[PDB]
Amino acid sequence: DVAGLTPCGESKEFARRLDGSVKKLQTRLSKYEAGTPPALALQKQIDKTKNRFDRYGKAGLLCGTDGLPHLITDGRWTHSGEFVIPGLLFLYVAGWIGWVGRSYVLFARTADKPTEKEIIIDVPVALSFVSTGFIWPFSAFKEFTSGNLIVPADEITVSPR
Amino acid sequence: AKSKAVPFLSQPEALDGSMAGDVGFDPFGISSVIDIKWLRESELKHGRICMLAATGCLVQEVVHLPGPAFSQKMALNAWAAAPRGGMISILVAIGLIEMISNRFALTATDMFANPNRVPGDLGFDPLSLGANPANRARFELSEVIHGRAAMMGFSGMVHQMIVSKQAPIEQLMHFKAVDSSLMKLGGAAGNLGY
Amino acid sequence: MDSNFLKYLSTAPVLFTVWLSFTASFIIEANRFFPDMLYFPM
Amino acid sequence: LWNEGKIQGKGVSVIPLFPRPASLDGTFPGDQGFDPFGFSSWVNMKFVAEAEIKHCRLAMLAFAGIMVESAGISFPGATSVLGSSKNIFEIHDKAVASGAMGQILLWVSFFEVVAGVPAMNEMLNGESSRIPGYYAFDPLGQGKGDKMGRMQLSEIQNGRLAMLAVSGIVHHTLITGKGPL
Amino acid sequence: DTTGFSGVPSQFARPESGVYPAEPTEQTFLGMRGPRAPGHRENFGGKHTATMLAIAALLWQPVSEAGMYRMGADGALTKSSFSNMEVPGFGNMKKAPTIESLFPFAKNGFDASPALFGKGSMIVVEDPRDGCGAYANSGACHTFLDEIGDALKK
Amino acid sequence: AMSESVPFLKKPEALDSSMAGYAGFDPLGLSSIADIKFLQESEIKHCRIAMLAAAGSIAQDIFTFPGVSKVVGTAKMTGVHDVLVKQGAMGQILLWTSFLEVFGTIALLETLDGKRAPGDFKFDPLGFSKNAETAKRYQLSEIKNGRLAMLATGGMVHGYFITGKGPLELLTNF
Ligand code: CLA
Ligand code: CLA
Ligand code: CLA
Ligand code: CLA
Ligand SMILES: CCCCCCCCCCCCCCCC(=O)OC[C@H](COP(=O)(O)OC[C@@H](O)CO)OC(=O)CCCCCCCCCCCCCCC
Ligand code: KC2
Ligand SMILES: CC1=C(C#C/C(C)=C/C=C/C(C)=C/C=C/C=C(C)/C=C/C=C(\C)C#CC2=C(C)C[C@@H](O)CC2(C)C)C(C)(C)C[C@H](O)C1
Ligand SMILES: CC1=C(C#C/C(C)=C/C=C/C(C)=C/C=C/C=C(C)/C=C/C=C(\C)C#CC2=C(C)C[C@@H](O)CC2(C)C)C(C)(C)C[C@H](O)C1
Numbered sequence: 050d051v052a053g054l055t056p057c058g059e060s061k062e063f064a065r066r067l068d069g070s071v072k073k074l075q076t077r078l079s080k081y082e083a084g085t086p087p088a089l090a091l092q093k094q095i096d097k098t099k100n101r102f103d104r105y106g107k108a109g110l111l112c113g114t115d116g117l118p119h120l121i122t123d124g125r126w127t128h129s130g131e132f133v134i135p136g137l138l139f140l141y142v143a144g145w146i147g148w149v150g151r152s153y154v155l156f157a158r159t160a161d162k163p164t165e166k167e168i169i170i171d172v173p174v175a176l177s178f179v180s181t182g183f184i185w186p187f188s189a190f191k192e193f194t195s196g197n198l199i200v201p202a203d204e205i206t207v208s209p210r
Numbered sequence: 211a212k213s214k215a216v217p218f219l220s221q222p223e224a225l226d227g228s229m230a231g232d233v234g235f236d237p238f239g240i241s242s243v244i245d246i247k248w249l250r251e252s253e254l255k256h257g258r259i260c261m262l263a264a265t266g267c268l269v270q271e272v273v274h275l276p277g278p279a280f281s282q283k284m285a286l287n288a289w290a291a292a293p294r295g296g297m298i299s300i301l302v303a304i305g306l307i308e309m310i311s312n313r314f315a316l317t318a319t320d321m322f323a324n325p326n327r328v329p330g331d332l333g334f335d336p337l338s339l340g341a342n343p344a345n346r347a348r349f350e351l352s353e354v355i356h357g358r359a360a361m362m363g364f365s366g367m368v369h370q371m372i373v374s375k376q377a378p379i380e381q382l383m384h385f386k387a388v389d390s391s392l393m394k395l396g397g398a399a400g401n402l403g404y
Numbered sequence: 405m406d407s408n409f410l411k412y413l414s415t416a417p418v419l420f421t422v423w424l425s426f427t428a429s430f431i432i433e434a435n436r437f438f439p440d441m442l443y444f445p446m
Numbered sequence: 447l448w449n450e451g452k453i454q455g456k457g458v459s460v461i462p463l464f465p466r467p468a469s470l471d472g473t474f475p476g477d478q479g480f481d482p483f484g485f486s487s488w489v490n491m492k493f494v495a496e497a498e499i500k501h502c503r504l505a506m507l508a509f510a511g512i513m514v515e516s517a518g519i520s521f522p523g524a525t526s527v528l529g530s531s532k533n534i535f536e537i538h539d540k541a542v543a544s545g546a547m548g549q550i551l552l553w554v555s556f557f558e559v560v561a562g563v564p565a566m567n568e569m570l571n572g573e574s575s576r577i578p579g580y581y582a583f584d585p586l587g588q589g590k591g592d593k594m595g596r597m598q599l600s601e602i603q604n605g606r607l608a609m610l611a612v613s614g615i616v617h618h619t620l621i622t623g624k625g626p627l
Numbered sequence: 628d629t630t631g632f633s634g635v636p637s638q639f640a641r642p643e644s645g646v647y648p649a650e651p652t653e654q655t656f657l658g659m660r661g662p663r664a665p666g667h668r669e670n671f672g673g674k675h676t677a678t679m680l681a682i683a684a685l686l687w688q689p690v691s692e693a694g695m696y697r698m699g700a701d702g703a704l705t706k707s708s709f710s711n712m713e714v715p716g717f718g719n720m721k722k723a724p725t726i727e728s729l730f731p732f733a734k735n736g737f738d739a740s741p742a743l744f745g746k747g748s749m750i751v752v753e754d755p756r757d758g759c760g761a762y763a764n765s766g767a768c769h770t771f772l773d774e775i776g777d778a779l780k781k
Numbered sequence: 782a783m784s785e786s787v788p789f790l791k792k793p794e795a796l797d798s799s800m801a802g803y804a805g806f807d808p809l810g811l812s813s814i815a816d817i818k819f820l821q822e823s824e825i826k827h828c829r830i831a832m833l834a835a836a837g838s839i840a841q842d843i844f845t846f847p848g849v850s851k852v853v854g855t856a857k858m859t860g861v862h863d864v865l866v867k868q869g870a871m872g873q874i875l876l877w878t879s880f881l882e883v884f885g886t887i888a889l890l891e892t893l894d895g896k897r898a899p900g901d902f903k904f905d906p907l908g909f910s911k912n913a914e915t916a917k918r919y920q921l922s923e924i925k926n927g928r929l930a931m932l933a934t935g936g937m938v939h940g941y942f943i944t945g946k947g948p949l950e951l952l953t954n955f
Contacts, residue, residue, distance in 0.1 A: 086401075093404040101440040108443060118442060130446035138444070152319075156629075156640040169415045173243045174630025177639060180632070181317035188317075197642050249633035271755050276748035283753070311659065315634075318670040319641050322634030326650035331649075333660030341812055387773040398436075452792050512883045538764055565789055574783070582788035674890045681886040692872070733815050740876050769913060 051121050051128070054111035062116025067102040071095055145182035148189055152178045213237075247322050247329045254330030264364040271377045281317035282378040286368070316395065367404015447595040452476045456600050475594075477600035492578055493570055499579030502605020509608045514613055514624040534616070563610060656680075688741035692728050708733070784808070801917075804923030818892050818899050824887075825900030828927020835933040842949040860940040 050056060057063045074095045081088040109127070122127035137202040153175055157166035181188070192198045212233035213219045221234050224241040228249060235240075241249060267285040274280045282288040289297075308316065311332045313319045324331075335341070340349060367378045373393055374381050412418070435441075459465075459479035466479045469487040474495055482576030484495070509534065514520075516532050529540045541547045565581070568574040579595055619625045636643035648662040655668065657678045682731040690741040711727035717723070732738065736746035759768040762776065769777075782792040785805040785926060793807035795817050802824075807813075812820060833930045838858060845853070852868060853861045865871045910916040935949045 091688070096253050097439070104440065105442070108445065108761075110443065120443075128443040133444075134444040136444065150643065159640045169411060169414050170416065170419055171629070171631075172414050172419070174639065177318040177632045182320055184316060192642075195642065195710050245630045245633040248634060272753060274751040274753075275746070276751060283755075295733070297629055313661065318634060320634065320640040320643075322635050323636050323643060324647045326647070327634075333654070335654055335660065336656055338654055338816065339814060341816070345810075345813060350716045377755070380757065382771045383755065383757055383759070383768065385769055385774045387774060392728070472928070542762075544759065561787060564808050564810070568791055574789075576789055580789055629888055660912075673893070675885075677886055677890050678883070681883040685883050688872075688879065741872060746863065 050111050051125070052119075053112075054113060054119055056106075056207035057108075057110045057118055058106035058131075060112035060114075060116055062114065063102070063106065063112045064116075066116045067099065071096050071100070074098065133155040141185075144185045144189065149178045149182040152181065221296035229354075231358070250329035254354070254357060257354065257361055260360040260364045262355055264360045264367065267364070267367050268379055271379045272353060283374065283380065284371065286371045315399065364393065448599070475598035476606075490570060493566070495578035496566060496569060496575060499605070500601065501581075501609060505608035505612045509612050510613070512612065512625075513627065516627045532625060534619065580627055687743070690726060690730050690740050691739035691743070692731070693730065792851050801920040802928070810887045816893065818895075820887070821899035822889050822892055825924070825927065828924060829900075829930060831934045835930040835937060838934070838948050840938040842947045857945075857947050859938060860941075860945075 074091055078088060078091040078095070081091070091148040094194060105118055110131075111118050111121065120131040124133065153170075156166075156171075156178070157163050160166045189198065211221050213221045215233045215235035216237055216242060219237055222236040222239060222241050224246040225232055227234075227238055229246070247328050270285050271283050274282075279291055281287075282291045303341055311334070312321060315323055315327070321327065340346060369376065370381060373388065374386060376384065376386075413422075449452065449471070454475065454477055458477075461480065464482050467481050467484060467486065469484065470477060470479070471483045471486070471491065474491060476498070491618070498540065506558045511539060512534050515534055515537055518532055527544055528546070529536055531537065538547065561581075565574075565576060588597070615626055632750055633639075639679045645774050649658070653668050654673070655671065656673045657680065657702070658671070681775065693709065695711055695722070696704050697707065697710055698704055710713060710724070712723065713721045714723045730739070738747040740746075744750055757768060759766075759770075762772045763773050764770060764773055784792055787806065787808050790808055792805055794814050795812035796805060796807055809896055820928065822847050835898065841857070841861075853864055858866055860914045862871060888897060888902065892899055910919060939946060944955070946954060
């Protein structure tokens, strides 16, 4: 397929991975009686292992010669669920955490004792900030263009050189 | 100075009997931590959503739009059956409604920035039904009460759909009791997993 | 509830321990009900 | 009449075992002590009075209905479509299945929502000064002095007796399998 | 201090606009209450909004029935798509976009009506009572009230 | 001030005898909920449509226009609706009444502005409301007959939903 890779649903090495993983569990299950708790624990692990291999095969992942799934991350849309969408999901959470943390440090500067607000957090106000993070892309860009994100270079302490 | 709802507790501050549906019920003291304006905005919103949702379940049992994608009497099955494109259309339209009706004052730090903004009052009166100021207090009371009742009712209906794989009216008309041989609560750690 | 005890629970180490235990806990729960998510399913 | 002080008034006790409470006012037609659990302290007196008169009126009408339908007395052709039994329970179940009970339910509930609920709301709000249980339903005269006097007390006592007797009749029919008359 | 979720941007050290318009009271039928321009509710008010909906609902009736209605040998009418109208002078484009491209009911199998729901694709109204009563049922119908009666007699 | 129609209830505080067909009957307080001019325009609209509907039920049972028995066979009352939707009869009726209802919408919005009496489309081609006393009497007659025809229409169509007979045929049989 892409980069000489094979879809995991027709990879023979993927098929042997699934079989070897189950033979390894079945020989541990061969040492226990049917209704025992170790037998049910291993029978649930054989169900989980088979389910995972079935899902990967039908997902559009590509396997290598080694029979393991490989991720395509060049930007193509047929493979966006491996990096681009998990990445879009990450950056939304990361910017949320950043926007919310930034909003609280600016609040704490206007406090009676600014450093006491950072070791003893005003939890009702800090929870007010965490809820605000859901629209951080719009809130932060408007913050930028309204001249409130970036401070000018001449209000920042620098080393003499 | 005791609560009227809970007679053995002290009456909570930020609850002064002005708001509709105010009977002194805040035993956990959330009103002392969270501004009552935000709490009433969220209560009216949750209640309005649940009025539509409870009505949605019952009417969806009775009446359907045409087509096989809309033929699910059980409302929890309708979630999966309904066309995904149109369901995400509903979601996107809700988001557009949320930003515009709130006028870009969406968050915990900028909703109610305008002193004119009132909790739950979005300017929505298309037919001017609240034009009469004599009906205002009882409309506010019965909106809050309908919202609370529908929150409880929809919660019950959803979890009765989970327990009994039946739609709400025909669960009442073809009732089957809980055997307890299925859907036992908890237990993920009692058997140590699996 | 005592305000000095609530001011103690608002201290940075308690909130850090509680929040990251809560955060760790819904990752653990999400991987119980929805395991082996190597990809966003699409 | 009123007989204020003698019967139905302040200083009147049906059972002086229980002292007459202060919260129970002496101006409500039918007040003859009997407030043990102290409900008059916190309930709306106007609401509970209207509820009492309505429970009284149903009890009387239901008693009349039970007597007629246990004596075998009927309207022409009613026993033809409905059952021939005199068991009040059996008639109710088959008149439900006939739709007659549905029609009475429909029309009672219509009156009770379009007229009963506004009447209750105004009587408790303070917009109309309607005495409890009043619906201006006096077609055949017999009002005037009596209307606010003995008839209010006669109605309330016949209604309380009708409530107790109707409960008695239905439970006797339950424990025996045979109705009265 | 700041209570938490107060909503005022000056209590969270957030930059506010400083501009907070006074809230008027006038409303429009399919729009919302709020600050408008002067004269806006006079031209785009309830009168405008109701009238525009009325025209849109009237013009829906030709659109919901859009098609090429042609008579055969007798007076019988055949319905066809407007795509069958081949425009003569547009090079390689011979089948043209029409009003059926902005309102493609047929492709989704809708069968629109001037009342929005046609004989095919009609509203489905079922009865959830399933042809039995609230109490004292017999057969494949056991109501909740029957379950209360079953428990009390056991 | 108590209601003339419901004596134990109060006067409905938005209704006055200067209205046509007033009896003080608003027990549910809807005249306080909705704007009263809208309610008045709606009642007269419902009244006139139901008057046509009841008279049409009666007349359709009496006679039927030439050629109609071909297309409309055993169908009667609501039954003819689906067969004539296939034909363009109901489509044409809907088209022209909707066309009139755009102007009805403009009229109602002027009524809510307060420049028009409810239901007043100024339609008096033949002369009946020249005199003021006659005008008021006919206003009351129109409202009362329209109210009666609303209930009539209800009964007639539900009688079809029960027996399938039609008004005149339900009188003749059973
Ligand atoms: C939410 C608060 C916050 C925000 C907005 C930023 C913002 C930034 N930091 Mg980070 N930083 C923070 C907290 C924060 N910092 C803390 C707590 C530490 C101590 C570990 C650091 C240590 C740190 C280093 C060493 C570096 C940065 C860098 C940067 C820059 C690039 C982003 C990055 O590399 O992230 C990296 C983030 C980290 C390495 C640690 C973040 C740890 C957590 C997730 C954030 C704190 C959450 C906080 C408790 C919020 C609570 C809010 C609540 C009270 C409402 C950017 C200026 C880099 C830079 O200058 O590049 C230009 C860089 O080299 N920061
Ligand atoms: C940008 C405008 C736009 C466009 C072009 C479309 C286009 C489409 N929609 Mg979508 N839709 C939109 C906005 C839009 N939608 C919005 C804003 C919502 C959210 C309210 C929806 C919700 C939605 C759902 C739920 C469904 C569609 C479906 C469809 C498709 C088939 C349509 C069809 O056969 O119609 C011809 C059929 C009709 C016109 C019948 C209409 C039925 C009535 C009018 C519904 C009652 C409306 C109800 C009262 C909603 C009130 C709330 C609202 C005012 C906020 C088509 C691709 C369907 C789909 O995905 O099919 C695969 C589907 O099931 N849409
Ligand atoms: C013994 C019963 C009794 C008594 C004393 C009263 C007395 C009163 N009622 Mg009440 N009422 C009753 C029963 C009674 N009612 C019942 C059962 C109903 C439901 C139908 C009503 C419904 C009612 C309304 C809706 C209203 C009143 C009102 C009034 C007042 C004025 C009317 C009046 O004086 O005429 C009463 C005249 C008589 C009681 C004469 C006797 C007629 C008898 C009881 C008929 C018997 C029927 C039949 C033969 C049953 C016996 C046979 C059966 C066993 C088989 C007065 C306080 C009005 C008021 O102002 O309330 C405050 C009002 O608005 N009543
Ligand atoms: C709510 C009103 C209403 C509705 C929906 C219908 C609908 C229908 N009628 Mg009925 N009809 C009506 C009123 C109504 N009619 C009235 C008022 C009469 C006369 C008393 C009739 C007499 C009638 C007959 C005899 C027949 C129908 C038939 C039909 C069907 C075919 C349409 C047709 O050609 O009718 C034709 C009907 C007419 C030409 C009468 C129209 C009456 C108009 C509205 C009077 C308006 C005059 C008034 C002064 C206003 C002037 C307008 C001005 C403001 C510009 C259709 C289902 C036919 C059918 O299929 O029956 C089985 C049929 O043969 N109608
Ligand atoms: C305002 C809204 C009010 C919501 C009310 C909630 C109603 C439903 C609550 C449970 C109903 C009855 C439970 C019996 C069921 C029961 O007790 O089962 C027991 C179960 C543990 O299993 P065991 O050790 O009992 O196994 C026992 C053996 O018999 C079987 O193996 O307890 C749990 O931990 C399950 C709940 C999850 C605990 C964490 C929940 C998520 C945490 C989120 C943050 C805190 C939220 C509140 C946590 C309490
Ligand atoms: C001639 C082109 C034209 C057409 C074909 C057309 C059709 C419809 C329909 C048809 C189905 C409806 C239902 C409708 C309703 C509304 N129109 Mg209207 N409309 C047209 C022109 C304008 C302009 C220029 C404005 C405007 C507005 C509004 C507002 C909001 C008022 C409010 O929120 O206060 C509402 C509810 C104003 C605005 O604010 O739009 C955001 C505004 O300036 N319209 N409009
Ligand atoms: C914002 C927010 C709130 C909220 C909220 C909520 C929960 C709002 C939810 C709203 C919903 C559920 C809206 C649903 C709209 C459905 C539509 C338009 C269906 C269209 C069908 C079509 C086009 C078709 C078709 C056809 C097809 C394809 C083929 C045929 O075989 C079948 C068929 C003929 C039918 C509230 C107001 C509560 C409060 C607060 O302010 C915050
Ligand atoms: C405001 C506004 C207007 C408007 C509007 C609208 C859309 C108004 C609609 C309001 C609605 C939909 C109110 C619905 C309330 C529902 C309740 C209280 C249900 C509670 C259920 C319970 C208690 C239960 C239960 C159950 C349980 C769990 C067990 C089950 O087995 C069964 C059972 C069902 C019995 C308009 C647009 C006209 C314009 C105007 O200018 C302004």
